[PDB]
Design a protein around this ligand. Structure first.
Ligand SMILES: [Ca+2]
Ligand SMILES: [Ca+2]
Length: 108
């Protein structure tokens, strides 16, 4: 998909392995290559993470973030999910919008 076209599978594997002892978004975004992608590439990624095309990554989607990169990956636990949301959700609506996703990828 766009994921495996935009990102290198080997980088995805690194980022997934890094999750074994706990998910940290900055480490994941670095390993995966997300923090090197352009504005426009990040919007494309956002659209495929937004499974229901709501315009947002809701918390229920965010729990399944790793599965967007590999379907067999684990779910995030509640601590992981809440910290990730907290990092991204600057406008206070408890979901991640396209602008917030770009900002989280490049400026954290
Ligand atoms: Ca959504
Ligand atoms: Ca938000």
């Amino acid at each position: 998909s766009k994921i495996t076209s935009i990102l290198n599978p080997a980088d995805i594997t690194k980022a997934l392995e890094q999750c074994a002892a706990g998910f940290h978004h900055t480490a994941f975004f670095k390993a995966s290559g997300l923090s090197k992608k352009s504005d426009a590439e990040l919007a494309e990624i956002f659209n495929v993470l937004d499974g229901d095309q709501s315009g947002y990554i809701e918390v229920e989607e965010l729990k399944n973030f790793l599965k967007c990169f590999s379907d067999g990956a684990r779910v995030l636990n509640d601590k992981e999910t809440s910290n990730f949301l907290a990092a991204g959700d600057s406008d206070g609506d408890h979901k991640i919008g396209v602008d917030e996703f770009k900002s989280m990828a490049k400026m954290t």
